[PDB]
Symmetry: C3
Subunit: 349 residues, 3 copies
């Protein structure tokens, strides 16, 4: 099975906020200035999670201003991320509308744009809705069919499975799914969707998701990439995961800073020298396990970005479900958290 | 994707024998008396594996006697387990017949019954046979369509795969598979079906089965639960697995005793206090590896419940297959087990 | 689900070159002399990877000469491996042609041949092409339909997935896929196909591939087997993997030497004695990590069999992709490898 895109491999997939609460295109203009090993193979001005939602309409204008003035020199491929969601026609329509604004050829961005990145997709028929949107945007703006590459973030159970019959869905003459380019794991939301929880709240490793995504990319002629690694300071951990991914055939990974771009650009390359193997630094050695109360102070005082919120919303949710349906447990639950904490936890949206 | 059931989460799935070889409803009457943290979110009077087969017709009567007299006060949901098997129309018919007896509304049980648990299912079309049985039972007894929740034990290769296209099978207008509620791993029989074997005979961990089941529950709007943890004394191991499951998004687990119900009810809840992390007790420290002879003494003298039998039937089976088809090996096999052990092992049903 | 073949289990799957660059049937004639624990349950004269390609037409004649003169006494089942490839009609046609030569009943081999082993298969419709070839070979040579067992090496992403709907594909009246017997992992080429890479170049472990293959064999009534373990000297490692496989329900494994046949024949059998568990030898303790330069000396001087070549072709390929598309990185890449190494690496076919 063969890849349909100019980039046979992609080591770095680097996101930037598109409009910050100054010159709101700040992050974009600098990220566009990156050259050499500090530049990602793929650059993602991110109008989705990186960007506060009320900044999002401005983000799309900034995407057009910055790629307009500066896209031409940017050495990698550019693929901004739209909003989208398998469960939310308004979000779908929003993403398509931004996509349509961004690509108006009279504005100078489109010709430096290689494609777009569609977060939160569902089952294959949700992928077909996005693909249909790309087809329409292309037609409205005299671009060639298939020229906008679509890449998807795999971040629900449904989308992990959808990778299974992609080879044959993709060849139906009623979609243009050949446009698929990257299959990008999104451990953060995948964790929410799967209702998983860890005692520290660090992402579970999901080796099977990563296998499944490497498999799907290989069987369908796409390129697999792994998702953000948030602990930016933990250079060793980031290299350890990239090495683990490389043993899955997942060869690119998300980068969050220009230092991550450098680690990421370098890791899959063979080392300079040979090597022989044998049979406040304290912070990178400490992980905290929050208490019910910790988590409810924290949430309470959040009203940490969205994703820290939703992550903890799980044990709290399991708590609320339990509280709502187990009167018989009401007493022992209180005898264990204090009556104050309990009806405080009950209050978390 | 959304859950169709009153219980958004289920931490404990607790089984009890329905008729023991006294008052044979003993186990049921006491388990029905459980309140607070000793009570499971889901209670499973088990007319299948917990119960000797010749006690099974009596079990179904006891299910009706006990839930009749006592169901009304039971604080969790009640879901008795029927017999069933993808390979055995008699078993299927038996399960449906017990189901039909149990729900006669003139008997007082049905109104405290939330649904049933169907063991040993196969490919999705085997799930449709069970669902058809629920539909018919409902109609015969003026219950509302879909009101009996069906939960399945995932304990064959076929049923692990069947979870893959569930979202779309479930929406066909010819089944009522929306009734699905729990997807419950059954490591014990899954191990038999997959012909796996371990040197101690302890269950392999099957992280992928558990991933696959969390994924399937999330993509189809069901709740994932893990299977019995037999080493009841190994409190640490049970918490270690529940924690491992929780990192898969598998949040409930089977409980075999009221102490397991307590561990299980407590584990997925956030801890009371914060915690900081840094980079004849002898029996819980010893595992025996049986010898061919051990295993044949043991089996021989069994003629350990069913499942210990079937588990060891695997290496013995591989032995018999080998013996039947490799005359050239007959000599070295004997020179290694003794001629006595060999034709003794050859005799194991 | 039930197995359709004489051998319910298969512990050893042993390959031999069919024609070596003397008497080119050497390897075959001796391997055919093996008896007892040194004999595999399944013997694979290998006209594919074991054999240089220009020796392949001679291999097929040797298969007929040796099985002719000696097949009758060989105590296991015999299943030679043909060439094949999901991407290469010439290879497919070649495999079928050798298969057709081999089975001419006037030549004495066919009656000691149990079936054939088809490497490199793709999606299920590629399996149907091979099956069609078996059907035709059978008909041309008055053999009974279905009497040649087909076994496949699982060594692409596509073929791992193809195992998913096998139970139902297999029952269509337009193929004879009941003939399926073994599902054999091929970690070596699977690693290429998935574009995985390890720092030592040792095969990644691919537990999920192995799970998926045990699952597929169980759901479809085939027997799962694992792929070659190249480090022939590492007896401990080979037993450790076989034990790991056995916990997946993968009970046979590839053997490369008569000593591996002996380990392999013995490992899944229960131990002789009980056992109690508690809570230049230097070479088997050293692994080398090659440098870019190492890998390019090595490749350069290869123009190590095919598979060592293709394996390293991955980081080199990722290097070339990067070099071709990242001018901005050209300077730092050189400042790190030397300008000599770089345009030398650029030259690797
Ligand atoms: Cl929707
Ligand atoms: Cl984890
Ligand atoms: Cl899978
Ligand atoms: Cl890839
Ligand atoms: Cl049946
Ligand atoms: Cl294990
Ligand atoms: Cl769940
Ligand atoms: Cl082809
Ligand atoms: Cl590995
Ligand atoms: Cl098997
Ligand atoms: K999101
Ligand atoms: K298409
Ligand atoms: K089209
Ligand atoms: K891959
Ligand atoms: K059973
Ligand atoms: K339905
Ligand atoms: K219906
Ligand atoms: K889940
Ligand atoms: K090959
Ligand atoms: K067929
Ligand atoms: K047929
Ligand atoms: K198996
Ligand atoms: Mg996300
Ligand atoms: Mg069972
Ligand atoms: Mg191969």
């Amino acid at each position: 099975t063969e890849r349909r895109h100019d980039r046979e491999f992609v080591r770095t997939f680097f996101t930037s906020p598109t409009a910050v609460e100054d010159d709101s295109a700040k992050m974009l203009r600098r990220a566009a200035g990156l050259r050499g090993m500090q530049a990602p193979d793929v650059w993602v001005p991110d109008n989705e999670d990186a960007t506060a939602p009320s900044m999002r309409d401005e983000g799309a204008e900034n995407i057009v201003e910055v790629i307009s003035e500066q896209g031409a020199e940017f050495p990698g491929e550019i693929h901004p991320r739209m909003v989208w969601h398998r469960d939310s026609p308004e979000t779908r329509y929003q993403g398509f509308q931004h996509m349509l604004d961004i690509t108006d050829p009279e504005r100078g961005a489109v010709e430096h744009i290689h494609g777009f990145v569609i977060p939160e997709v569902g089952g294959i028929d949700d992928w077909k809705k996005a693909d249909e949107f790309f087809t329409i945007v292309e037609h409205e703006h005299g671009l060639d069919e298939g020229s906008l590459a679509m890449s998807v973030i795999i971040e629900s159970g449904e989308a992990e499975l959808a990778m299974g019959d992609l080879r044959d869905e993709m060849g139906k003459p009623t979609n243009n799914l050949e446009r698929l380019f990257l299959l990008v794991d999104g451990e953060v939301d995948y964790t929410k969707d799967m209702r998983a929880m860890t005692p520290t709240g660090e992402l579970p490793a999901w080796p099977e998701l990563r296998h499944n995504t490497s498999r799907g990319a290989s069987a369908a002629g796409c390129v697999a990439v792994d998702g953000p690694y948030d602990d930016i300071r933990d250079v060793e951990g980031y290299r350890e995961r990239m090495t683990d991914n490389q043993a899955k055939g997942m060869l690119g990974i998300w980068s969050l800073t220009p230092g991550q771009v450098v680690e990421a650009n370098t890791s899959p390359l063979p080392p300079k020298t040979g090597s022989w193997l044998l049979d406040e630094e304290l912070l990178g050695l400490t992980s905290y396990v929050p208490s019910m109360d910790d988590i409810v102070d924290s949430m309470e005082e959040f009203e940490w970005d969205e994703a820290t919120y939703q992550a903890a919303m799980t044990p709290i949710s399991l708590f609320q479900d339990v509280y709502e349906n187990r009167p018989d447990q009401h007493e022992e639950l209180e005898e264990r958290y204090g009556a104050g904490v309990v009806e405080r936890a009950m209050e978390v949206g």
